Coordinates of C-alpha atoms and ligand atoms in Angstrom, one line a residue:
Chain V
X1 CA 0.0 0.0 0.0
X2 CA 0.9 3.8 0.0
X3 CA 3.0 3.5 3.2
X4 CA 5.5 1.2 1.4
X5 CA 8.8 1.5 3.3
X6 CA 8.5 5.2 4.2
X7 CA 9.4 6.3 7.8
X8 CA 8.3 10.0 8.3
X9 CA 7.7 11.9 11.5
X10 CA 4.8 14.5 11.7
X11 CA 5.9 17.9 10.4
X12 CA 5.1 21.3 12.1
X13 CA 7.0 24.6 12.1
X14 CA 6.5 27.6 14.4
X15 CA 6.0 30.9 12.5
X16 CA 8.4 33.9 12.9
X17 CA 11.5 31.7 13.7
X18 CA 14.7 33.7 14.3
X19 CA 18.5 33.0 14.3
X20 CA 20.2 31.0 11.6
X21 CA 18.8 29.2 8.6
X22 CA 18.3 26.6 7.2
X23 CA 16.7 24.7 10.1
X24 CA 16.2 21.0 10.3
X25 CA 12.6 19.9 10.5
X26 CA 12.6 16.1 10.2
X27 CA 14.5 13.3 8.5
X28 CA 12.6 11.5 5.8
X29 CA 13.6 7.9 5.1
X30 CA 12.8 4.8 2.9
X31 CA 13.8 1.4 4.2
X32 CA 14.4 0.4 0.6
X33 CA 17.9 1.8 1.4
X34 CA 18.8 -1.6 2.9
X35 CA 18.9 -3.1 -0.6
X36 CA 19.7 0.0 -2.7
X37 CA 21.0 3.6 -2.6
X38 CA 18.0 5.9 -2.2
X39 CA 17.8 9.5 -3.5
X40 CA 15.3 11.9 -2.0
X41 CA 13.4 14.9 -3.4
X42 CA 10.4 17.0 -2.5
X43 CA 7.8 18.5 -4.9
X44 CA 5.0 21.0 -4.3
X45 CA 4.2 24.6 -3.5
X46 CA 7.0 25.8 -1.2
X47 CA 9.4 23.2 -2.6
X48 CA 9.8 23.2 -6.4
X49 CA 6.7 25.4 -7.0
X50 CA 6.0 29.0 -5.9
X51 CA 7.2 30.0 -3.3
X52 CA 10.2 27.9 -4.4
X53 CA 12.8 26.7 -1.9
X54 CA 11.0 27.6 1.3
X55 CA 11.5 23.9 2.1
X56 CA 14.4 21.8 0.8
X57 CA 15.5 18.2 1.3
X58 CA 19.0 16.7 1.3
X59 CA 19.1 14.3 -1.7
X60 CA 21.3 11.6 -0.1
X61 CA 20.4 12.0 3.7
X62 CA 16.7 12.9 3.5
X63 CA 17.0 15.8 6.0
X64 CA 14.0 18.2 5.4
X65 CA 14.8 21.8 6.2
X66 CA 13.1 25.3 6.2
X67 CA 15.1 28.2 4.7
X68 CA 13.3 31.3 6.1
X69 CA 10.7 32.5 8.7
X70 CA 7.1 31.4 8.0
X71 CA 3.8 33.3 8.6
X72 CA 0.7 31.2 9.4
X73 CA -1.5 34.2 8.6
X74 CA 0.0 34.2 5.0
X75 CA 0.3 30.4 4.6
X76 CA -0.9 28.1 7.3
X77 CA -0.4 24.8 5.5
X78 CA 2.0 23.4 2.9
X79 CA 1.3 20.3 0.9
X80 CA 4.4 18.6 -0.4
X81 CA 5.3 15.2 -1.8
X82 CA 8.4 13.2 -0.8
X83 CA 10.0 11.1 -3.5
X84 CA 12.5 8.2 -3.4
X85 CA 14.5 6.8 -6.4
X86 CA 17.4 4.5 -7.0
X87 CA 20.6 5.3 -8.9
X88 CA 18.8 4.7 -12.2
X89 CA 16.1 7.3 -11.4
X90 CA 13.3 4.7 -10.9
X91 CA 11.0 5.2 -7.9
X92 CA 11.5 2.8 -5.0
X93 CA 8.4 4.3 -3.3
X94 CA 5.0 5.8 -4.1
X95 CA 5.2 9.5 -3.5
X96 CA 4.1 10.2 0.0
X97 CA 2.0 13.3 0.6
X98 CA 3.7 15.4 3.4
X99 CA 1.7 18.1 5.2
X100 CA 3.6 21.0 6.9
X101 CA 1.5 22.9 9.4
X102 CA 2.7 26.4 10.5
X103 CA 2.1 27.1 14.2
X104 CA 2.6 30.1 16.5
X105 CA 6.1 31.1 17.9
Chain W
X1 CA 26.7 56.8 -6.5
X2 CA 24.5 59.1 -8.6
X3 CA 22.8 59.0 -11.9
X4 CA 24.1 61.8 -14.2
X5 CA 20.5 62.9 -15.0
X6 CA 16.9 61.8 -14.5
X7 CA 16.8 58.4 -16.3
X8 CA 14.2 55.8 -17.2
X9 CA 13.9 52.9 -14.7
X10 CA 14.7 50.3 -17.4
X11 CA 18.0 52.1 -18.2
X12 CA 19.2 52.2 -14.6
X13 CA 18.0 48.6 -13.6
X14 CA 19.0 46.6 -16.7
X15 CA 17.5 43.3 -15.4
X16 CA 13.8 43.1 -16.6
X17 CA 12.5 41.6 -13.3
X18 CA 14.4 44.1 -11.2
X19 CA 13.2 47.1 -13.3
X20 CA 9.6 46.0 -12.8
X21 CA 10.2 45.6 -9.0
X22 CA 11.8 49.0 -8.9
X23 CA 8.9 50.6 -10.8
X24 CA 6.5 49.6 -7.9
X25 CA 9.0 50.6 -5.2
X26 CA 9.5 54.0 -6.8
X27 CA 5.7 54.4 -7.3
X28 CA 6.0 54.9 -11.1
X29 CA 3.5 53.7 -13.7
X30 CA 5.9 52.3 -16.3
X31 CA 9.5 51.1 -16.4
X32 CA 10.0 53.7 -19.2
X33 CA 9.3 56.5 -16.6
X34 CA 12.2 58.7 -15.6
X35 CA 13.3 58.7 -11.9
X36 CA 15.7 61.1 -10.1
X37 CA 18.7 60.4 -7.9
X38 CA 16.5 62.0 -5.1
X39 CA 13.8 59.3 -5.8
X40 CA 16.5 56.5 -5.6
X41 CA 17.8 57.9 -2.3
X42 CA 14.4 57.3 -0.6
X43 CA 14.7 53.5 -0.9
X44 CA 16.0 52.1 2.4
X45 CA 14.7 48.4 2.2
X46 CA 14.3 46.0 -0.7
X47 CA 12.5 42.6 -0.6
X48 CA 13.3 41.2 -4.0
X49 CA 13.4 37.4 -3.4
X50 CA 12.0 34.8 -5.9
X51 CA 11.9 37.3 -8.9
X52 CA 14.2 35.4 -11.3
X53 CA 16.7 38.3 -11.1
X54 CA 19.9 37.7 -13.0
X55 CA 21.6 41.1 -12.3
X56 CA 21.6 43.7 -9.6
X57 CA 23.0 46.4 -11.9
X58 CA 21.5 49.7 -10.9
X59 CA 21.3 48.9 -7.1
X60 CA 24.6 50.9 -6.5
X61 CA 22.4 54.1 -6.9
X62 CA 20.2 53.1 -4.0
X63 CA 22.8 54.7 -1.6
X64 CA 20.5 54.5 1.5
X65 CA 19.7 50.8 1.5
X66 CA 20.0 49.2 5.0
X67 CA 18.3 45.9 4.3
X68 CA 18.0 43.7 1.2
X69 CA 16.6 40.3 0.2
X70 CA 17.8 38.9 -3.1
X71 CA 17.5 35.3 -2.0
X72 CA 16.3 32.6 -4.5
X73 CA 17.3 34.4 -7.7
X74 CA 20.0 33.7 -10.3
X75 CA 22.7 36.2 -9.1
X76 CA 26.4 35.8 -9.9
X77 CA 28.1 39.2 -9.8
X78 CA 27.4 41.3 -6.6
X79 CA 29.8 44.2 -7.5
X80 CA 26.9 46.8 -7.2
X81 CA 26.8 46.3 -3.4
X82 CA 30.4 47.4 -2.9
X83 CA 29.7 51.0 -1.7
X84 CA 26.4 50.4 0.0
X85 CA 28.0 50.9 3.4
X86 CA 24.6 51.5 5.2
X87 CA 23.7 47.8 4.7
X88 CA 22.9 46.1 8.0
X89 CA 21.2 42.9 6.7
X90 CA 21.7 40.9 3.5
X91 CA 19.6 37.8 2.5
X92 CA 21.2 36.1 -0.5
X93 CA 20.8 32.4 -0.1
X94 CA 20.2 30.3 -3.2
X95 CA 22.0 32.2 -5.9
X96 CA 25.2 31.4 -7.9
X97 CA 27.6 33.7 -6.1
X98 CA 31.3 32.8 -6.2
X99 CA 33.1 36.1 -5.6
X100 CA 32.1 37.8 -2.4
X101 CA 35.0 40.4 -2.6
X102 CA 32.3 43.2 -3.0
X103 CA 31.2 42.6 0.6
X104 CA 34.6 43.5 2.0
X105 CA 33.9 47.0 3.2
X106 CA 30.3 46.5 4.4
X107 CA 31.3 46.9 8.0
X108 CA 27.9 47.8 9.3
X109 CA 26.5 44.3 8.5
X110 CA 25.1 42.4 11.4
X111 CA 23.3 39.8 9.4
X112 CA 24.6 38.0 6.3
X113 CA 22.9 35.0 4.7
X114 CA 24.8 33.3 1.9
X115 CA 23.9 29.6 2.2
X116 CA 23.5 27.6 -1.1
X117 CA 25.9 29.5 -3.3
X118 CA 29.3 28.7 -5.1
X119 CA 31.5 30.2 -2.4
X120 CA 35.0 28.8 -1.6
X121 CA 36.9 32.0 -0.6
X122 CA 35.6 33.7 2.5
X123 CA 38.6 36.0 3.0
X124 CA 36.4 39.0 2.1
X125 CA 34.5 38.5 5.4
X126 CA 37.5 39.1 7.7
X127 CA 36.6 42.8 8.5
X128 CA 32.9 42.4 9.0
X129 CA 33.4 42.4 12.8
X130 CA 29.8 43.5 13.6
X131 CA 28.2 40.3 12.3
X132 CA 26.0 38.5 14.7
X133 CA 24.3 36.2 12.1
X134 CA 26.4 34.5 9.3
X135 CA 25.1 31.6 7.2
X136 CA 27.5 29.9 4.8
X137 CA 26.3 26.2 4.6
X138 CA 25.9 24.5 1.2
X139 CA 29.0 26.2 -0.1
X140 CA 32.5 24.7 -0.8
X141 CA 34.5 26.4 2.0
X142 CA 37.5 24.6 3.5
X143 CA 39.3 27.5 5.3
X144 CA 37.5 29.4 8.0
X145 CA 40.5 31.6 9.1
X146 CA 38.6 34.7 8.0
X147 CA 36.0 34.0 10.8
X148 CA 38.6 34.5 13.6
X149 CA 37.9 38.2 14.2
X150 CA 34.1 37.9 14.0
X151 CA 33.8 38.3 17.8
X152 CA 30.1 39.4 17.9
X153 CA 28.8 36.2 16.1
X154 CA 25.8 34.5 17.8
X155 CA 24.6 32.2 15.0
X156 CA 27.0 30.5 12.5
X157 CA 26.9 27.9 9.9
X158 CA 29.2 26.9 7.1
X159 CA 30.3 24.0 4.8
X160 CA 31.3 21.8 3.3
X161 CA 35.0 21.0 3.4
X162 CA 36.1 22.4 6.8
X163 CA 38.5 20.3 9.0
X164 CA 40.1 23.0 11.1
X165 CA 37.9 24.7 13.7
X166 CA 40.7 26.6 15.5
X167 CA 39.6 29.9 13.9
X168 CA 36.5 29.6 16.2
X169 CA 38.6 29.9 19.4
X170 CA 37.7 33.6 20.3
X171 CA 34.1 33.5 19.1
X172 CA 32.8 33.1 22.6
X173 CA 29.6 35.0 21.8
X174 CA 28.4 32.0 19.8
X175 CA 25.1 30.5 20.8
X176 CA 24.1 28.5 17.7
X177 CA 26.6 26.6 15.6
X178 CA 25.9 24.2 12.7
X179 CA 29.0 22.4 11.3
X180 CA 27.0 19.6 9.6
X181 CA 28.5 17.9 6.6
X182 CA 32.1 19.1 7.0
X183 CA 35.1 16.9 7.6
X184 CA 35.6 17.6 11.3
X185 CA 37.0 15.1 13.7
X186 CA 38.6 17.4 16.3
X187 CA 36.1 19.5 18.2
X188 CA 38.4 20.5 21.2
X189 CA 38.0 24.2 20.2
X190 CA 34.3 23.9 21.1
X191 CA 35.1 23.8 24.8
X192 CA 35.9 27.6 24.5
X193 CA 32.3 28.3 23.3
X194 CA 30.8 28.1 26.7
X195 CA 27.7 30.2 25.6
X196 CA 26.5 27.5 23.0
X197 CA 22.9 26.6 23.3
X198 CA 22.6 24.6 20.0
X199 CA 25.3 22.5 18.3
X200 CA 24.5 20.7 15.1
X201 CA 27.4 18.6 13.8
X202 CA 25.7 15.9 11.7
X203 CA 27.8 13.8 9.2
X204 CA 31.3 14.6 10.4
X205 CA 34.0 12.2 11.8
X206 CA 33.7 13.0 15.5
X207 CA 34.7 10.3 18.0
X208 CA 35.7 12.3 21.1
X209 CA 33.0 14.4 22.8
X210 CA 34.9 15.3 26.0
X211 CA 35.3 18.9 24.7
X212 CA 31.5 19.3 25.2
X213 CA 31.8 18.7 29.0
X214 CA 31.7 22.4 30.1
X215 CA 29.1 23.4 27.5
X216 CA 26.3 23.1 30.1
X217 CA 24.0 25.7 28.4
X218 CA 23.5 23.2 25.5
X219 CA 19.8 22.4 25.0
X220 CA 20.0 21.0 21.4
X221 CA 22.7 18.6 20.2
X222 CA 22.9 16.7 17.0
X223 CA 25.9 14.3 16.5
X224 CA 24.0 12.1 14.0
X225 CA 26.4 10.2 11.5
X226 CA 29.7 10.5 13.4
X227 CA 32.1 8.0 15.0
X228 CA 30.7 8.0 18.6
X229 CA 30.8 5.1 20.9
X230 CA 31.5 6.4 24.5
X231 CA 29.2 9.2 25.4
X232 CA 29.8 9.6 29.2
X233 CA 30.3 13.3 28.7
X234 CA 26.6 13.8 27.8
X235 CA 25.7 13.3 31.5
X236 CA 27.1 16.8 32.2
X237 CA 24.6 18.3 29.7
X238 CA 21.5 18.4 32.0
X239 CA 19.7 21.2 30.0
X240 CA 19.4 19.0 26.8
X241 CA 15.9 18.8 25.4
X242 CA 16.7 17.5 21.9
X243 CA 19.4 14.9 21.3
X244 CA 20.2 13.2 18.0
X245 CA 22.9 10.5 18.2
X246 CA 21.6 8.3 15.3
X247 CA 24.1 6.4 13.0
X248 CA 27.0 6.0 15.4
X249 CA 28.4 2.9 17.2
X250 CA 26.8 3.6 20.7
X251 CA 25.8 0.7 23.1
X252 CA 26.0 2.3 26.6
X253 CA 23.0 4.6 27.3
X254 CA 23.7 5.0 31.1
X255 CA 25.0 8.6 30.5
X256 CA 21.5 9.7 29.3
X257 CA 19.6 8.5 32.4
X258 CA 19.7 11.8 34.2
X259 CA 18.8 13.9 31.1
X260 CA 15.1 14.2 32.2
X261 CA 14.4 17.4 30.2
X262 CA 14.7 15.3 27.0
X263 CA 11.6 15.5 24.8
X264 CA 13.2 14.2 21.5
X265 CA 15.7 11.4 21.4
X266 CA 17.1 9.9 18.2
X267 CA 19.2 6.8 18.7
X268 CA 18.6 4.7 15.5
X269 CA 21.4 2.8 13.7
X270 CA 23.5 2.1 16.8
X271 CA 24.7 -0.9 18.9
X272 CA 22.0 -0.7 21.6
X273 CA 20.7 -3.8 23.4
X274 CA 19.7 -2.3 26.7
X275 CA 17.3 0.7 27.0
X276 CA 16.7 0.6 30.8
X277 CA 18.6 4.0 31.2
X278 CA 15.7 5.6 29.2
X279 CA 13.0 4.5 31.7
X280 CA 13.0 7.8 33.6
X281 CA 12.9 10.1 30.5
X282 CA 9.2 10.6 31.0
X283 CA 9.0 13.9 29.0
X284 CA 9.9 12.1 25.7
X285 CA 7.4 12.6 22.9
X286 CA 9.7 11.3 20.0
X287 CA 11.9 8.3 20.5
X288 CA 13.8 6.6 17.6
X289 CA 15.4 3.1 18.4
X290 CA 15.4 1.5 14.9
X291 CA 18.3 -0.6 13.6
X292 CA 19.7 -1.7 17.0
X293 CA 19.9 -5.0 18.8
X294 CA 16.8 -4.7 21.0
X295 CA 14.8 -7.5 22.3
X296 CA 13.6 -6.3 25.7
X297 CA 11.6 -3.0 25.3
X298 CA 9.9 -3.2 28.7
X299 CA 11.4 0.2 29.8
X300 CA 9.3 1.9 27.2
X301 CA 6.1 1.3 29.2
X302 CA 7.2 4.3 31.4
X303 CA 7.2 6.8 28.5
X304 CA 3.6 7.9 28.7
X305 CA 4.1 11.0 26.5
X306 CA 5.3 9.3 23.3
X307 CA 3.5 10.3 20.2
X308 CA 6.2 9.0 17.7
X309 CA 8.2 5.8 18.2
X310 CA 10.4 3.8 15.9
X311 CA 11.6 0.3 16.6
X312 CA 12.1 -1.3 13.1
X313 CA 15.0 -3.6 12.4
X314 CA 15.5 -5.0 15.8
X315 CA 15.1 -8.5 17.5
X316 CA 11.8 -7.7 19.4
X317 CA 9.2 -10.5 20.0
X318 CA 7.2 -8.7 22.7
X319 CA 5.6 -5.4 21.6
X320 CA 3.2 -5.2 24.6
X321 CA 5.3 -2.5 26.4
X322 CA 3.8 0.0 23.9
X323 CA 0.2 -0.9 25.0
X324 CA -0.1 2.0 27.6
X325 CA 1.3 4.6 25.2
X326 CA -2.2 5.9 24.2
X327 CA -0.9 9.2 22.7
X328 CA 1.0 7.2 19.9
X329 CA 0.2 8.6 16.5
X330 CA 2.9 6.8 14.5
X331 CA 4.4 3.4 15.4
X332 CA 7.1 1.7 13.2
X333 CA 8.2 -1.8 14.1
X334 CA 8.8 -3.6 10.7
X335 CA 11.5 -6.3 10.7
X336 CA 11.1 -7.7 14.2
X337 CA 9.7 -11.0 15.5
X338 CA 6.3 -9.8 16.8
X339 CA 3.5 -12.4 16.5
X340 CA 0.9 -11.2 19.0
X341 CA -0.5 -7.7 18.3
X342 CA -3.4 -8.0 20.9
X343 CA -1.9 -5.1 23.0
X344 CA -2.1 -2.7 20.0
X345 CA -6.0 -2.7 20.3
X346 CA -5.3 0.0 23.1
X347 CA -3.7 2.4 20.6
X348 CA -6.9 4.2 19.4
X349 CA -5.0 7.3 18.2
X350 CA -2.7 5.4 15.9
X351 CA -2.6 6.9 12.4
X352 CA 0.5 5.2 10.9
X353 CA 1.1 1.6 11.8
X354 CA 4.2 0.0 10.1
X355 CA 4.5 -3.7 10.9
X356 CA 5.8 -5.6 7.7
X357 CA 8.4 -8.4 8.1
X358 CA 7.1 -9.7 11.5
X359 CA 5.3 -13.0 12.5
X360 CA 1.8 -11.6 12.6
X361 CA -1.0 -14.2 11.8
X362 CA -4.1 -12.4 13.2
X363 CA -5.3 -8.9 12.3
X364 CA -8.4 -9.0 14.5
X365 CA -6.9 -6.9 17.3
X366 CA -6.5 -4.0 14.8
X367 CA -10.2 -3.9 13.8
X368 CA -11.2 -0.9 15.8
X369 CA -8.1 1.2 14.8
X370 CA -10.2 3.2 12.4
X371 CA -8.0 6.3 12.5
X372 CA -5.2 4.5 10.6
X373 CA -4.4 6.3 7.3
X374 CA -1.1 4.4 6.6
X375 CA -0.5 0.7 7.1
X376 CA 2.2 -1.9 6.5
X377 CA 1.6 -5.7 7.0
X378 CA 3.5 -7.2 4.1
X379 CA 5.9 -10.2 4.3
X380 CA 5.2 -11.9 7.6
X381 CA 7.0 -15.2 8.2
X382 CA 6.8 -17.8 11.0
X383 CA 7.6 -21.4 11.8
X384 CA 5.1 -23.4 13.7
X385 CA 5.9 -25.8 16.6
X386 CA 6.8 -29.2 14.9
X387 CA 4.2 -31.8 14.2
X388 CA 4.9 -35.5 13.5
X389 CA 5.5 -36.5 9.9
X390 CA 2.7 -38.8 8.7
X391 CA 1.7 -40.0 5.2
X392 CA -1.3 -37.6 5.6
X393 CA -0.6 -34.4 7.6
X394 CA -3.3 -31.9 8.3
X395 CA -2.9 -28.6 10.2
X396 CA -5.4 -25.7 10.8
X397 CA -5.1 -22.5 8.8
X398 CA -4.4 -19.7 11.4
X399 CA -4.2 -16.7 9.1
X400 CA -7.0 -14.3 10.1
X401 CA -8.1 -11.1 8.3
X402 CA -9.1 -7.9 10.3
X403 CA -12.8 -9.1 10.0
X404 CA -12.0 -12.5 11.6
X405 CA -12.3 -14.4 8.3
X406 CA -9.7 -17.0 7.6
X407 CA -7.5 -16.1 4.6
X408 CA -7.3 -19.1 2.2
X409 CA -3.7 -20.0 1.3
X410 CA -2.3 -18.5 -1.9
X411 CA 0.1 -21.4 -2.5
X412 CA 0.7 -24.7 -0.6
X413 CA 4.0 -26.7 -0.8
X414 CA 4.3 -30.4 -1.8
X415 CA 1.0 -30.6 -3.6
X416 CA -1.1 -29.7 -0.5
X417 CA -4.7 -28.6 -0.6
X418 CA -7.2 -26.5 1.3
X419 CA -10.7 -27.3 2.6
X420 CA -11.5 -24.6 5.1
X421 CA -10.2 -24.5 7.8
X422 CA -7.7 -27.4 7.1
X423 CA -4.5 -27.6 5.1
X424 CA -3.7 -31.1 4.1
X425 CA -0.7 -32.9 2.6
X426 CA -0.3 -36.3 1.1
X427 CA 3.5 -37.0 1.5
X428 CA 4.9 -40.1 -0.2
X429 CA 8.2 -39.8 1.8
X430 CA 9.5 -38.1 4.8
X431 CA 10.2 -34.4 4.3
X432 CA 11.7 -32.0 7.0
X433 CA 9.0 -29.4 6.5
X434 CA 6.0 -28.2 4.5
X435 CA 4.8 -24.7 4.0
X436 CA 2.1 -22.4 2.6
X437 CA 1.8 -18.7 1.7
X438 CA -1.0 -16.1 1.9
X439 CA -1.5 -12.7 0.3
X440 CA -4.5 -10.5 1.0
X441 CA -5.0 -6.8 0.3
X442 CA -6.7 -5.1 3.3
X443 CA -7.8 -1.6 4.4
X444 CA -8.2 -0.7 8.1
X445 CA -9.7 2.8 8.5
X446 CA -8.1 4.5 5.5
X447 CA -4.8 2.6 5.6
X448 CA -4.1 0.1 2.9
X449 CA -1.6 -2.7 2.6
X450 CA -1.1 -6.3 1.5
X451 CA -1.2 -8.7 4.4
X452 CA 1.1 -11.5 3.2
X453 CA 3.4 -14.2 4.5
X454 CA 5.0 -17.6 4.5
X455 CA 4.3 -20.2 7.1
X456 CA 6.7 -23.1 7.7
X457 CA 5.6 -26.4 9.3
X458 CA 8.4 -28.6 10.6
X459 CA 7.8 -32.4 10.5
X460 CA 9.5 -34.7 13.0
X461 CA 10.8 -38.1 11.9
Ligands
CL1 CL1 16.8 45.2 -19.7
CL2 CL1 10.3 46.1 -1.2
CL3 CL1 18.6 6.2 12.0
CL4 CL1 8.7 0.2 10.1
CL5 CL1 -2.8 4.0 3.0

């Protein structure tokens, strides 16, 4: 089913964060990494679509980060999709819908 | 810098996107409209992120700029910033900047964001002694000597080729440091940064953490993906609330027992067989123990506040210590030896239940877990207690769907057949074992999976 071998914690981010960016949110992982090298990407509005690069993921490690302060009042919720592919580019998982909620903070 | 004469916006700002932005800022109707130097001098801030800007030509005429955001554009050359000495804050992450020499005399800067660029050479930062925020990660920096005089820094990050941290020695104002994905083994200099509150050092080559001993103000620490085994020093860090030690070679958790302010603890991919030191960490909401050598998870029954727990890739038979953890939202225990899931009936808040590669035969305890949206039950495997080999061997089918219905075998070894509820073989000669498989799609709540497995039946001579 859609879960496949994904291991993903719930994702929430306080608005108006200060200090240094980027900031680690969660690590995304597929257990398909036991048999093959897995490469991670995220798609959606706030990732590869406007506003682009608000959220980024490390391709090899799966660390999902935020790059700037958020404003719940402007955007309360982001809908993204995590992807997992092998060295050949073929998907080892079905894209998992990831929901990022913005909180107060 | 001054324009010689009143000039059209699109002759000053040669980049099409910038010209259009500048039109709005200057309150003009068209980019063809003429603006004066006096008009340009009124601009003190510029939020110009995500505009597809390829050139900042023209910005040298905005003499009074104190704060700019050119992040997430396509910038290379930043020469027009050279004489904008009123600049206090610059956001310029996610561009293609390699030459930061134009920043050299911007001594009023207190905030400089340059992560995700093409920077190797940071020598032009040496005189920016008022900096309190500097972000340089996702670059190709190996030499941080230019940071040695930045004695007002509070938050710092950089990457990705640094081995020598000695330039950090006098930066005692530091409160937040992220050195993730560098080539650092020696962190002895960090002992001098006694004001540190957060230290992120993921994916380095760190084996000795004794320098952290006096860093008692630390509340967040990530040493994920290093060379850690002995962690005795961590006992000194009683203010820690978030600790990530995943992907090391740790076995001894006794140093963590007194860290009662911990709410998040990541310990996956280690050498752990004993979690009794975790029994008193009652404020935990997130605990990761995947890819260890766990069998006894009894200490977990104490952790009443857990909402997220990972235990996959261990040697666990008895999952029942999770039964009282009624706040659990996501539970991951694939690749263990769990057969009985009766205790999971208690987990009414469970949304994600990952349990593939166990020894589960009976889904009936999961029937009322109708809040499940993600489910994994694939590839179960177990071996029954032996039965005597006979010419005709019959065993009951024990595979139960969530509804209580027996799932008929998908395949049966050695020519065997099924007449509900019995699996029967006709065996012309002694064989060590027989087997059967099952495979059944199932949805519980909204979570969908294939409940599948192989069942082995040993036969005694
Ligand atoms: Cl142009
Ligand atoms: Cl603006
Ligand atoms: Cl891990
Ligand atoms: Cl799992
Ligand atoms: Cl599902």
